């Protein structure tokens, strides 16, 4: 009808959502978790120093077995190695050397990779030929791939440079579901434990929750000030942390539809490249652009620990499913394990 | 204590490490050149002329003087996540020299030369590009020479204090503008070259500029400058 009328209606709906969030905010997470005893200073040492990459490590992912770790390098290599004995199980070269994201299937049979090339490459680790071949080269995006996650052996969610997310199947091989609600460059994806919802951040301050079955963004959160680069779902599945180019890591809750806390410190001024939660959800690990990583208290919002074992910018950070170890990969081609 | 399967897995990991170390030599000897344009700057013609020596991301890998060169083209840096080119050796920037009177196709009262300078400024000001060198290729040199005599550049740019209707003066003015628009003029050298799609010695200039860049960083590593 009228553009001005539509803009006025959008502003009114935004004000209504803001008023509802303010009314539902009778307290704060810090005011409630103030009575909780602090975790205290934690000490995580480099148990394993996985080396061998020829360039900077960009992504990582853990399997269900909590033993095999996949890592992508700018030299066009996916290295899947055992964490207990630092032995490289597989080392597969990539057609496109520019890789930015890698995902390990929960069943352990498949792996996925993507990056500056708009082609998401899925390889089958378990094959009779022995060599891990290229099972699929699925490509229907208009921008560079940024994140990949495996829902199952058939469904896979990916995000590209454009403001779209894509759910693909392996049986048909095409883009089954499309999400076109964002406005910026989508960066990271995190699947909920129930494999039905996933939050995604873009170049703007908006982090949107998308449903796998419905296909529409149920909730959005606009509380940051720069581009959200990292994402991680809470172990329970109703919360998620977002890290941006500023030192602030903000925790949002799906049920409350509002931010809970903002883990940040005046000393830290760099950005965020990777955010991961522990199995209990009490400790929130975040990789910063500086030569170290931090571990905050997810409830009390305090810097519990600092891991300064990496010499270059920490790029990828992951926590095992059982919570035994934490893998950290920086641009110095060195993957480290912390316990 | 390692069992038979454990020792065999260790041996397989050692073979993988040996292959990776063998490829590490080629990785270190590799010279990465990020190719970027500015719109109607002879991109397709330049790629066609380069494929002779060679024979959205496009990779052209070749070997010159027993050293490998890999040219990566984006295909047409506004996402803040393109820091993947922080380790490239150099960046080629192609600009059309006939953009004085060539208004942008959008016709929003702006010359293509201003847009090219703005793109160059936004690219060189990136922090990840502080350690990389820049090689500026101003294409359409013959078209520039044929156009500067028809229309003077002083009418559209009120900062050319030199003598109009010439060729060397306009080239010097363009080089000076591209160099002053960059804000470091030190960390890494800037190289300017004027050529068209006729000659095939364009790769020799790129090789010479890459050699000069490697010499410049070896001088810093050697504590000579």
């Amino acid at each position: 009808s009228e553009l001005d009328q539509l803009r006025q209606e959008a502003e009114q709906l935004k004000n209504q959502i803001r008023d509802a969030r303010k009314a539902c905010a009778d307290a704060t997470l810090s005011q409630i978790t103030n009575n909780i005893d602090p975790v205290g200073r934690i000490q995580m040492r480099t148990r394993r120093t996985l080396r061998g990459h020829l360039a900077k490590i960009y992504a990582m992912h853990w399997g269900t077995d909590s033993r095999l770790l996949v890592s992508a390098s700018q030299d066009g290599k996916l290295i899947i190695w055992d964490s207990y004995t630092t032995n490289k199980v597989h080392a597969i070269p990539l057609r496109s050397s520019w890789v930015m994201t890698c995902a390990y299937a929960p069943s352990g049979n498949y792996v996925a990779c993507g990056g500056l090339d708009n082609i998401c490459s899925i390889y089958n680790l378990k094959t009779r030929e022995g060599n891990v071949r290229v099972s699929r080269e699925l490509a229907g995006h208009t921008g560079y791939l940024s994140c990949c996650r495996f829902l199952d052996d058939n469904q896979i969610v990916t995000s590209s440079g454009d403001t779209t997310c894509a759910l693909w199947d392996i049986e048909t091989g095409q883009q089954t579901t499309t999400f076109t609600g964002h406005t910026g460059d989508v960066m990271s994806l995190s699947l909920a434990p129930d494999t039905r919802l996933f939050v995604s951040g873009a170049c703007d301050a908006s982090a949107k929750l998308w449903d796998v079955r419905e296909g529409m963004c149920r909730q959005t959160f606009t509380g940051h000030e720069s581009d959200i680069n990292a994402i991680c779902f809470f172990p329970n599945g109703n919360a998620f942390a977002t890290g941006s180019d500023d030192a602030t890591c903000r925790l949002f809750d799906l049920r409350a539809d509002q931010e809970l806390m903002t883990y940040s410190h005046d000393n830290i001024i760099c950005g965020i490249t990777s955010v991961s939660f522990s199995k209990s959800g009490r400790l929130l690990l975040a990789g910063y652009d500086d030569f170290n990583c931090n571990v905050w208290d997810a409830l009390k919002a305090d810097r519990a620990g600092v891991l300064a074992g990496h010499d270059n910018r920490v790029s990828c950070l992951g926590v095992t499913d059982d919570g035994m170890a934490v893998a950290t990969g920086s641009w110095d081609s060195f993957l480290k394990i912390w316990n | 204590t390692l069992s038979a399967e454990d020792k065999a897995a260790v041996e397989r990991s050692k073979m993988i490490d040996k292959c990776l170390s063998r490829e590490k030599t080629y990785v270190k000897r590799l010279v990465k050149i990020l190719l970027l344009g500015a719109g109607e700057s002879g991109k397709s013609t330049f790629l066609k002329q380069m494929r002779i020596i060679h024979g959205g991301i496009h990779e052209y890998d070749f070997e010159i003087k027993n050293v490998p060169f890999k040219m990566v083209d984006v295909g047409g840096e506004r996402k803040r996540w393109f820091e993947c080119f922080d380790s490239v050796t150099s960046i080629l920037f192609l600009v059309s020299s006939s953009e004085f009177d060539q208004v942008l196709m959008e016709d929003r009262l702006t010359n293509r030369l201003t847009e090219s300078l703005n793109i160059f400024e936004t690219i060189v000001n990136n922090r990840v590009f502080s350690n990389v060198s820049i090689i500026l290729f101003l294409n359409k040199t013959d078209l520039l020479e044929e156009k500067v005599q028809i229309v003077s550049i002083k009418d559209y740019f009120l900062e050319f204090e030199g003598d109009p209707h010439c060729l060397r003066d306009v080239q010097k003015f363009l080089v000076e503008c591209f160099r002053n628009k960059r804000r470091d003029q030190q960390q890494k050298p800037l190289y300017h070259h004027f050529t068209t799609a006729i000659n095939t010695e364009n790769i020799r200039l790129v090789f010479r500029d890459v050699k000069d860049t490697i010499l410049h960083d070896n001088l810093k590593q050697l504590m000579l400058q």
Partner: single-chain antibody
């Protein structure tokens, strides 16, 4: 995935020969190889093993130094050069591929092998409970095995392989590491054990389930098989 073995025939005692195995359908350079033997009146016996990168080469105590094994990766071929053959070498030789990593299935594919006839200890001993047990279709059969020493290792996973050999066919991986089923086998097979005594349970038997079941350990390089339990219709 195919292994074709050739170079078999009647050889006078004290002679020499060269068995050649051609591999296809898989990366030969990424798989370690094992030459095993089976006597017409006995069970399987391990002979030699070569690594994927030709770095780890081992032989059985009975053929230590007497035989040699090599591989050509550009040609995808495996050569077994044997010299001074005796009556103990008159058997059918099989070539087996095995890749070693976390979650791998070593001894997955067995070649057809080739026969060889002649005119003429600190090792783990695997003992089968019964040489042959009568079975019926649709029933449950439990094959028991005993080892000289515990096969449990400090790494946490046992190393026990149950294999099936049908009459007139090459052996096939049935269960590896006592817990994981091989690729392309029915889920009716199950394996259990505390480290010394091992059990293989088969429910809802079929026509192809009959044959000789063998047990193998993988803790030391001198791999030893078992007597083999014969399940007949």
């Amino acid at each position: 995935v195919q292994l074709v073995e050739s170079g078999g025939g009647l050889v006078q005692p004290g002679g020499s020969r060269k068995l050649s195995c051609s591999a296809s359908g898989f990366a030969f350079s990424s798989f370690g190889m094992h030459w095993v033997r089976q006597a017409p009146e006995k069970g399987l016996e391990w002979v030699a093993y070569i690594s994927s990168g030709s770095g780890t080469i081992y032989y059985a105590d009975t053929v230590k130094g007497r035989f040699t094994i090599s591989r050509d990766d550009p040609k995808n071929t495996l050569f077994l050069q044997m010299t001074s053959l005796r009556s103990e070498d008159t058997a059918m030789y099989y070539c087996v591929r095995s890749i070693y990593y976390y979650g791998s299935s070593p001894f997955d594919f067995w070649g057809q092998g080739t026969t060889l006839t002649v005119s003429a200890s600190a090792d783990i001993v695997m003992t089968q409970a019964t040489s042959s047990v009568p079975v019926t279709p649709g029933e449950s059969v439990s094959i028991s095995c005993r080892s000289s020493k515990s096969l449990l290792h400090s790494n946490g996973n046992t190393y026990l392989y149950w294999f099936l050999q049908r009459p007139g066919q090459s052996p096939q991986l049935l269960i590896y590491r006592m817990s994981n089923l091989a690729s392309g086998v029915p889920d009716r097979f199950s394996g259990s054990g505390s480290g010394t005594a091992f059990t293989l349970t088969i429910s809802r038997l079929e026509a192809e389930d009959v044959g000789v079941y063998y047990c193998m350990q993988h803790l030391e390089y001198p791999l030893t098989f078992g007597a083999g339990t014969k399940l007949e219709l």
